[PDB]
Amino acid sequence: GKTLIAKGTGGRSSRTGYTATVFGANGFLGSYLTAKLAKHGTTVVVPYREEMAKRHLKVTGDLGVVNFLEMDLRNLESIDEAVRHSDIVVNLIGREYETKNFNYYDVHVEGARRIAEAVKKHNIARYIHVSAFNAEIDSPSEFNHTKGLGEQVTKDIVPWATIVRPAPMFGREDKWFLDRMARSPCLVSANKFQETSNPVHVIDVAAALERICFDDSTVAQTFELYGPQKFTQKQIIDMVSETLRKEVRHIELPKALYQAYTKATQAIWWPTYSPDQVERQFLSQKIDPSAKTFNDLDLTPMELPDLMFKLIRPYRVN
Amino acid sequence: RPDAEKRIAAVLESFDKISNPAAITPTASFAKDLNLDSLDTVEVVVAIEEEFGIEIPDKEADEIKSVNQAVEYILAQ
Amino acid sequence: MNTFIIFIILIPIVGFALLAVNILLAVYKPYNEKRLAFNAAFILVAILFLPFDLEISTLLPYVMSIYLVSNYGFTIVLLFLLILIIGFVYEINTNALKINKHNKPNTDSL
Amino acid sequence: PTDFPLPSQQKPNSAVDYTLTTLDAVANWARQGSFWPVTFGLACCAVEMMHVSAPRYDQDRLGIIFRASPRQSDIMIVAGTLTNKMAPVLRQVYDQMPEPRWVISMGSCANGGGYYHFSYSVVRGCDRIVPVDVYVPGCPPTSEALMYGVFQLQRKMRNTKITRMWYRK
Amino acid sequence: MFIGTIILVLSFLGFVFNRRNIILAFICLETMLLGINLILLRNSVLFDDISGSLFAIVIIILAGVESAIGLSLLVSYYRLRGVINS
Amino acid sequence: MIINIVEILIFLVCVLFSVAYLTVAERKTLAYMQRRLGPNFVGYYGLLQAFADAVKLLLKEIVLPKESNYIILVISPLITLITALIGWVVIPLGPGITLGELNLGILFSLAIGSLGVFGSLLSGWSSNSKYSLLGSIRSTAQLISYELILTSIFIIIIMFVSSLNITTIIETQRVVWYCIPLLPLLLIFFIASVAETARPPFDLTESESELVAGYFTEYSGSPFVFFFLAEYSNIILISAFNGYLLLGGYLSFNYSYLFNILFNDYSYVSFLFEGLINSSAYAIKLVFLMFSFIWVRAAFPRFTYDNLINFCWIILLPLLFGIFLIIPSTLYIFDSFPTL
Amino acid sequence: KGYSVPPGETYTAIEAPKGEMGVYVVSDGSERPYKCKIRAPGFAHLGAFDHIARGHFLPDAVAIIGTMDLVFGEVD
Amino acid sequence: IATAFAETVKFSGSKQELQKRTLALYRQFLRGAPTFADLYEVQFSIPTIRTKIRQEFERHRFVDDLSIQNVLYAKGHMEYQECINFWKQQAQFLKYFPEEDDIQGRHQPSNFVDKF
Amino acid sequence: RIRAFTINFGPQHPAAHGVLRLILELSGEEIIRSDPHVGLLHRGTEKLIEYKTYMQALPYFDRLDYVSMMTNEQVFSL
């Protein structure tokens, strides 16, 4: 795929011609990247699974820049159809919990293998696959085990594999980084009640994914999106409780006693706090020595606290 | 009066564009001594009234040219 | 037991029931975007509300046993209502809001 | 783990659904039955909206009983043209509105800018502001037209399939 | 008569140690007048028909006017309805 | 023990199913009164709209950062519990001889109709909005000012009764059809009855978008159906309460049933029928009453708070104190007092 | 091309049922009007509203909006 | 027959008097900055407001004619009028604040080579 | 001295057929100062018919005053 001058234009509907396809994108991260992507005149095929949740991604652009397809990772034909006409494709995918119909396997391994097989069958340039921080092949968080397997499969076939490993993210409606800070009825977990690592702001993640998804000369490199400075622990909860309510109330329960709530979690209508999250609370950022970052793609991601002042401020006392 | 101008020579020192605090004699000018702009003059006046949590009228803002005048109006409460 | 205690005990649990149905299955996802003044007639109405309640509380035992006090409880409560109705004829003279700004004076020239 | 059974499945289209079509259609029928908006009502198209409250093409023969309050509402009929000046107030109304929310663009001006569309002070369609689920064409669309759009929205509601989408069809 | 003395004493030493919120003091002084009636009513029940309960209906009717004068006087703890002051 | 819990379930399902279809009923009768047709589409006939609307508006549930959830998640449940339902503890002529209530009737209904008012006030206390709580204090002030002249008139109509248990009013009133035929201040009771349970021609604190696009708080979700159901249930309770004392239960065809049941049944076949016609009597005296509420919804417009307090503390209350300067007087004059 | 209009100014007012509507048109002498200024009673009565509304209450003001025909599609 | 925050329109003659008048306007427009940050809930700090207000007045330091400076004074005092209360909304209010860089991505480094 | 507060009257539906943004100030729930605030609906017809022809002008022109349509047509035509 060949293009013209650069990414950043100065006006909407001065359209590019880049035809992207973003998997997932109904939820958290995929809001802001297609918000950055349809802002500057690119056609987006965004497939979905729930009709009522796909709506608020339409207003990012005006016409032909948002499209809905009815994918499902079970159906080969749906994903086959989904990227026939595409030019670049990203998949942010993968719940932080198993469903009542999905394993942790085959939501980013064979779910990834199907779509990457469609990529190879369609010769799609610039396949970008997100994957988790701390994506090892070791056991202890089988989430991380499965993301390592997914990166292995995306490197098995398709050398066009720009793998990106963001840190724990930080934005509006943070699924399990600040919703467990903001609502937070009793945030209670972390047997090791400290000793977490790098936060990254979400619009900086989206800017990183935007500045990777258009430039060339970055095929088959893997990125890790480090936190800017602080790599800080659960002491940021204290900065979260710098807001006057201080309702955070960490009660530092025993480990095997904490499992039962997670084993309750499979029975519930809505997802809560499945045990691979509890296992990742014993992990940290096993930071890759050799993976290109924001300084390679020429960005400086924003710091934690002053952005947290904006980001949590409905929730003050007076 | 005593150590009110300590606070004032703390605020004006914390204010930028004055590279020499040794050039800040307390009983001294603003625009002659330090080359403060007439805009920046009332800028640091509003900084002073915001530090002490006090509100000034318009003519009191008109007459301030040196900080001895400022301390003399600070003395009014 | 067994008569209406069941009603005043069943009903709070029914209230918590129809409350606690949709606390779970309604979608929340709360995104974002979710001294004073006065008048005399906003205050004195409720202040003067109270004595005219508890004179009815005064009147309520009398109207319970209107009998066993014949020819005489009538006289006492007529005196009570006279002493109260003169308080009413005090308060009829004053309690109303006043429109502050409406002027009419004739105009003069030199 | 490490292995996968999951085959090539159908589109969201089915008929073998035990009990979930029934329960989902009950909840969907409840949502499809009452269906009240909040008036936003900006111009001439609001005069036709209040003609739907007129006795000829009555709202209340269907259930449309609108409150004047964005929390007690379901769908938000944007009628009339939409100024540049209004649009932040409109999105702020849109956000304080519960999650099963839809938007009807009533009137040509409300979608794709309509008859002005070339003003400095008009918004070129509410697609630049709020996500819309049913459009309604034309300067003032008929009371017929608004009710036809309402029935088409309810026909969309009859395909929401939310409970069996919890089942991941 | 535990039931009335305990609520009376707690209202009383709540009215003592009340270094916050003038109206909590004011309503503790109110609740004294229903801490006393739980004494009075059960003494009347342990005795008889209406001897002390007449004083009970008196103290209820008068406790109303207590709270009425207390509100309508607390309104004038300041200037009246509202003006500039300090 | 089993018979009374199935009794109480029958009575609760009667009142709940009743107040459910009442909103459809009033909307239909407004609609025919507004020369249109009401909910004519819902499902199977068109009798079902509220019964689907309840399931509809459960599943919304917002909260507001301007207010503690702990008060507004309970204060519309407060008036749902106390104002709506346990006013029926008095069993306001549960229309037979029998009730589900022991005794000491009318002032219990007084106490609970009194108890609803700060359920309204603390509801309006919420959100700390300087334009809201003054409207709340307005609503509650007019609410108590017409509570007072419900109170001071149904204590004077029981001066023809003197017995405070619930039934004795009703067995007293069957001789004269005492309720309205001896005194027409029913009508001012009626015009008091629209205010103390505001479903009114007054609509006064329902300045729906005169404030910042919200009237009460807009506590939508389960508190909305709580407030909605409790307002309508307070309406049918106070309407029953009108049909309790100052309108009559026990219609005179049951007094004539001496000339009917003695021509119908032989001797006490399980009391099979008389409670049913007695219920029929009380029901047709109750729904015909609230049909006038649904009139006065759509006949006369809102009523202008300063004039509303004018209408309380200047006109109706001195007429009232005259009227119980004469009803102690006139029975003392003509013959004599009532016993108990 | 529309049509020819002779040049010059005019103003014409009729009583619309909301009040005197005036139309002030400066015609170029060409196909298109060089200036048109409307004049609306709903823009004058709205202007008078502050001088009228003083010394009332808010439910007075709700009625006094509707009396002077304040349909705001005749503002500009 | 009213005001909202005492907007007056009377242009003086002498440039010294207009200088003093714009100076007092600058004081009120600077003093209202924590009231602005309260009122609109911006992300940036009050000194960001102050340096941008100073930037806006340094945009018109070297304007010659007092009979241009009159309507510049009217624009300044009038937008102070529409900022001192809640006429402007925060979406209307951010039109003064090119705050963030990351919206743009990589862009023009003001070289001729990268116009192409 | 007077210490009065203010309200915003109608964002959307206070008076029907009007976007009546009225910034209204009260002392004792008395409208001591009234500041109507209209102009939310400045659709700019007054600009737009400077580039339209006269036959084209009229369906702009009864979009003003949308409850008395052909009377507004008639005043433009006169």
Ligand SMILES: CCCCCCCCCCCCCCCCCC(=O)OC[C@H](COP(=O)(O)OCCN)OC(=O)CCCCCCCCCCCCCCCCC
């Ligand atoms: C004599 C022998 C018998 C002795 C016993 C006597 C018992 C008689 C029965 C009670 C007497 C009825 C008294 C009725 C009181 C009503 C008085 C009243 O409303 O005054 C009007 C007043 C007008 O306001 P204002 O301007 O302040 O007046 C000054 C004008 N210079 O106030 C107002 O603003 C008017 C507001 C009224 C709102 C009413 C709304 C509609 C109500 C109609 C529904 C009732 C119909 C259904 C019931 C009828 C059944 C037949």
Ligand SMILES: NC(=O)C1=CN([C@@H]2O[C@H](COP(=O)(O)OP(=O)(O)OC[C@H]3O[C@@H](n4cnc5c(N)ncnc54)[C@H](OP(=O)(O)O)[C@@H]3O)[C@@H](O)[C@H]2O)C=CC1
């Ligand atoms: N703690 C964290 O969350 C972190 C996130 N990441 C990575 O970022 C990626 C995106 O994060 P985030 O925006 O929060 O993801 P989302 O919470 O937004 O969910 C991803 C979307 O894809 C859908 N989806 C795709 N495939 C499936 C499938 N087989 N089964 C069920 N749902 C599927 C999901 O549900 P639906 O089908 O209903 O649309 C969802 O809508 C994550 O996948 C994660 O690997 C990395 C660092 C930290």
Ligand code: SF4
């Ligand atoms: S869409 Fe048509 S009817 Fe509606 S405001 Fe625009 S011009 Fe008027």
